């Protein structure tokens, strides 16, 4: 398999900030979801979830396809909850319809987390819509009640190594988990709509208690009303993940460097970009602009 990025005949940079700023708008004025919270945690997600069925070996999976459209894909029991990014952005692909779907999915991504304070993110379009059967079947992505081992083999899959797999991690910062959706409750600090490092100040300070959730599984619970999900708790078990995570709650800009960089290439995985390709852009924010 080979997946040639090929941009939308005739659209360029000036397109794509459109749709960035659409979207933008639209997180701006929906904020009262999941209890104000907005859409960007589920966005992130979004993005994240449809470039984590990549499979490094045979390149099947990954976002080029737009396969979330479909419905063994749609229906995963992993994406349980990301359907109300989806709808969000329905309207948004209704506005710019030569836009494809993976090129929309993972832009919104892109919006939220730049739009949240986090940093640039630099993206690339050409991601080609395609058909039903190219979509990976379910169980491509990790569950939540492992140890650093499955985690490191798990990510390993998707070309990343340990400082990627921490950086990536940082993202949990945002939003909550929900009981309804994976089996686990709770948001892991208080700036859940604001990108920072506070997953990392998180694990590493507060007083984590082991505890089984209403849906008996067990979550890391802490006094502050907190919690972390065993997988992100392994971030402090391993040794080797330890000292990033130290390294990140250190040092903001060196998170968010490296959050950048791993986010980008996560969503670009599986992906061959030609040699006459547009370089990747840099979209500015609505504040940038005076939006
Ligand atoms: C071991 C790896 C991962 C596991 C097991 C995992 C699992 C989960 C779980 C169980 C939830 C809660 C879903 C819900 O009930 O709504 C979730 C939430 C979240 N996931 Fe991950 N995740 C991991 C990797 C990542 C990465 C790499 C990203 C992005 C870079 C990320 C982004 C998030 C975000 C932003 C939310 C909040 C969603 C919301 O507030 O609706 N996760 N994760
Ligand atoms: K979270």
Not at 18 to 40: Q, T
Not at 79 to 88: D, E, P, V
Not at 128 to 150: H, Q, S
Not at 242 to 269: G, P, R
Request: charged share 25%; net charge negative; proline share 5%.
């Amino acid at each position: 398999l080979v997946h040639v990025a090929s941009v939308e005949k005739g659209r360029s940079y000036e397109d794509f900030q459109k749709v960035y700023n659409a979207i933008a708008l639209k997180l701006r004025e929906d904020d009262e979801y999941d209890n104000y919270i907005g859409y960007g945690p589920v966005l992130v997600r979004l993005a994240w979830h449809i470039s984590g069925t990549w499979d490094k070996h045979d390149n099947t999976g990954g976002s080029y396809g737009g396969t979330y459209r479909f419905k063994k894909e749609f229906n995963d029991p992993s994406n349980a909850g990301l359907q109300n990014g989806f709808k969000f952005l329905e309207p948004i692909h209704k506005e710019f319809p030569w836009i494809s779907s993976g090129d929309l999915f993972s832009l919104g991504g892109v919006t939220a987390v730049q739009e949240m304070q986090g940093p640039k993110i630099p993206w690339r379009c050409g991601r080609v819509d395609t058909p039903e059967d190219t979509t990976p079947d379910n169980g491509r992505l990790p569950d939540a009640d492992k140890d650093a081992g499955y985690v490191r083999t798990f990510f390993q899959r998707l070309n990343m190594n340990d400082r990627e797999v921490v950086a990536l991690m940082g993202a949990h910062a945002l939003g909550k988990t929900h009981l309804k959706n994976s089996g686990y409750e709770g948001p892991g600090g208080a700036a859940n709509n604001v990108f920072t490092n506070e997953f990392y100040l998180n694990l590493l300070n507060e007083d984590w208690k082991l505890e089984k959730n209403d849906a008996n599984n067990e979550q890391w619970d802490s006094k502050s009303g907190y919690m972390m999900l065993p997988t992100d708790y392994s971030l402090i078990q391993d040794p080797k993940y330890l000292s990033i995570v130290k390294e990140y709650a250190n040092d903001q800009d060196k998170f968010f460097k490296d959050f950048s960089k791993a986010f980008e290439k996560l969503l670009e995985n599986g992906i061959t970009f030609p040699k006459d390709a547009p370089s990747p852009f840099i979209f500015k924010t609505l504040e940038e602009q005076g939006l």
